[PDB]
Design a binder for this molecule. Structure first.
Ligand SMILES: Fc1ccc(CC2CCNCC2)cc1
Length: 377
């Protein structure tokens, strides 16, 4: 697995990507790693923001599925032509798989200007694949066609360039300290999990835990933010704001409508509280908790042209699709997507940003009753 260490790159806020090759002879592409979706899709036309794109004409092994795909988010989208071809990961396992590939031929607010990636690898399950669950996800094909074990793990670091590791088929013990604690994957569609309790600085939000998961809680490497449902976010913010009364900031800041700034080397770590999410455990009435920091939910925006100060963005936000454990959470931890056992493991990351005031943690066991009631039907 040392071959795969440090095989992810990126820039702050623009996601983590891995090098992949498609077609024969191999075309090299940088591909976004995204556990919040399930299509393998790559740029296939010369959109001006793209360094590189898939040229199906150069590939002996390409096969057209003679079907299209239309994949919208909030305005919005990409649109493509389906096929299969041969696919490798240079700094991954030593195999080549025949995989479905959506050749992207039109898009809107998908590709990012200034970024170094040209596609997206959806690592979640067939249920959320487009246009339907019959389109076999890349990782399914990988596992089905080779002897790679059915799991992958992610260490997302981040510092400007970010870096990390996607270990495919296994676990690298150099990448974490202490023990892995596992929470069940509640359903194989997104990587759905259940939060059973939330503490800010070590204080419960006394909230019907069923809310914390309204209507979803998911682990998503493609999202920068820790994202909370309206009602939970409203209460979430209430306590973070009061935890941090020492100094004040605007209404918009908490709604991600304005960024906040301090001078270089003058930020208050400690005027902000820790977040602890207790996740459902492997055993009835047993949980564990993961604890992050404001360094994780306060992300230092590199270069605003309108300031030379140290400006950070509030990384927590609302949703109607639900909770989203994104880069804010995942950068604190080594995270193991144990598909074979339907569970996701969290351990303290060997690369997380710490000191000797406070530190990221994964602790258990705790006793939590009615953790099923936290799940939404
Ligand atoms: F710039 C973008 C836009 C949209 C996406 C797809 C999302 C899938 C769910 N996880 C977050 C990303 C990626 C990049």
């Amino acid at each position: 697995f040392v071959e795969m260490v440090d095989n992810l790159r990126g820039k702050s806020g623009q996601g983590y990507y891995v090098e992949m090759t498609v077609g024969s002879p191999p075309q090299t592409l940088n591909i976004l790693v995204d556990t919040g979706s399930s299509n393998f899709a790559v740029g296939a036309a010369p959109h001006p923001f793209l360094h590189r794109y898939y040229q199906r004409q150069l590939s002996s092994t390409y096969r057209d599925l003679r079907k299209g795909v239309y994949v919208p988010y909030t305005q919005g989208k990409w649109e493509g032509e389906l096929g299969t071809d041969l696919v490798s990961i240079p700094h991954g396992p030593n195999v080549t798989v025949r995989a479905n590939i959506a050749a992207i031929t039109e898009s809107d607010k998908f590709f990012i200007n200034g970024s170094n990636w040209e596609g997206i690898l959806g690592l979640a399950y067939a249920e959320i694949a487009r246009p339907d669950d019959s389109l076999e996800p890349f990782f399914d094909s990988l596992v089905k066609q080779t002897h790679v074990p059915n799991l992958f793990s992610l260490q997302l670091c981040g510092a400007a360039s970010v870096g990390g590791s996607m270990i495919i088929g296994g676990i690298d013990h150099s990448l974490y300290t202490g023990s892995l604690w596992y929470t069940p994957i509640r359903r194989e569609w997104y990587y759905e999990v259940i939060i059973v309790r939330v503490e800010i600085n070590g204080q419960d939000l006394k909230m019907d835990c069923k809310e914390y998961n309204y209507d979803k809680s998911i682990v998503d490497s493609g999202t920068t933010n820790l994202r909370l449902p309206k009602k939970v976010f409203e209460a979430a913010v209430k306590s973070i704001k009061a935890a941090s009364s020492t100094e004040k900031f605007p209404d918009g800041f908490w709604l991600g409508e304005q960024l906040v700034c301090w001078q270089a080397g003058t930020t208050p770590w400690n005027i902000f509280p820790v977040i602890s999410l207790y996740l459902m455990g492997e055993v009835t009435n047993q949980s564990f908790r993961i604890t992050i920091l404001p360094q994780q939910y306060l992300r230092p925006v590199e270069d605003v042209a309108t300031s030379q100060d140290d400006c950070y963005k509030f990384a927590i936000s609302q949703s109607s699709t639900g909770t989203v454990m994104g880069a804010v959470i995942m950068e604190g931890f080594y995270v193991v997507f144990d598909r074979a056992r339907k569970r996701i493991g969290f351990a303290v990351s060997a690369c997380h940003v710490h000191d000797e005031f406070r530190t990221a943690a994964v602790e258990g066991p705790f006793v939590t009753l009615d953790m099923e009631d936290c799940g939404y039907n």
